[PDB]
Amino acid sequence: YDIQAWKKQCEELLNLIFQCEDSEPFRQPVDLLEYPDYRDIIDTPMDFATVRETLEAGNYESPMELCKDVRLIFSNSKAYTPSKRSRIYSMSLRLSAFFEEHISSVLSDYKSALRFHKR
Numbered sequence: 256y257d258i259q260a261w262k263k264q265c266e267e268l269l270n271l272i273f274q275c276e277d278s279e280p281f282r283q284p285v286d287l288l289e290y291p292d293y294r295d296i297i298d299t300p301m302d303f304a305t306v307r308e309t310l311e312a313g314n315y316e317s318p319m320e321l322c323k324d325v326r327l328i329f330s331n332s333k334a335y336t337p338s339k340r341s342r343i344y345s346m347s348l349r350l351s352a353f354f355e356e357h358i359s360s361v362l363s364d365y366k367s368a369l370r371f372h373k374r
């Protein structure tokens with residue numbers, strides 16, 4: 256029932272993601288010189304370094320907020336891809352499955368901690 260435990264759990268999950276080869280296209284903001292039409296399709300760029308920095312700055316109030324930003328990295332890849340069989344989009348799908356399988360317990364534990372506190 257540790258209400259604060261999600262933060263270190265998310266830091267550790269981000270460490271695992273940064274080690275994953277599938278995260279390489281998503282570690283830093285999409286290079287706008289390499290993809291000049293990116294902002295014509297994507298309204299809100301997001302990347303894992305931004306997520307980590309937001310977390311480290313103390314600017315997430317809950318793991319659900321972090322999860323919304325990570326999910327935005329994946330939805331941006333899905334929206335920008337010219338093909339559902341592209342290399343970068345295929346990496347995003349694997350990385351998304353890995354993230355979802357690991358974040359589930361972080362969210363569950365946080366929500367359980369809040370409920371225990373309210374009780």
Ligand SMILES: O=C(O)c1ccccc1O
Pocket residue numbers: 280285290331332333335336337338341342343344345
């Ligand atoms: O699928 C792609 O080719 C792609 C390229 C740049 C950024 C995100 C992407 O999904």
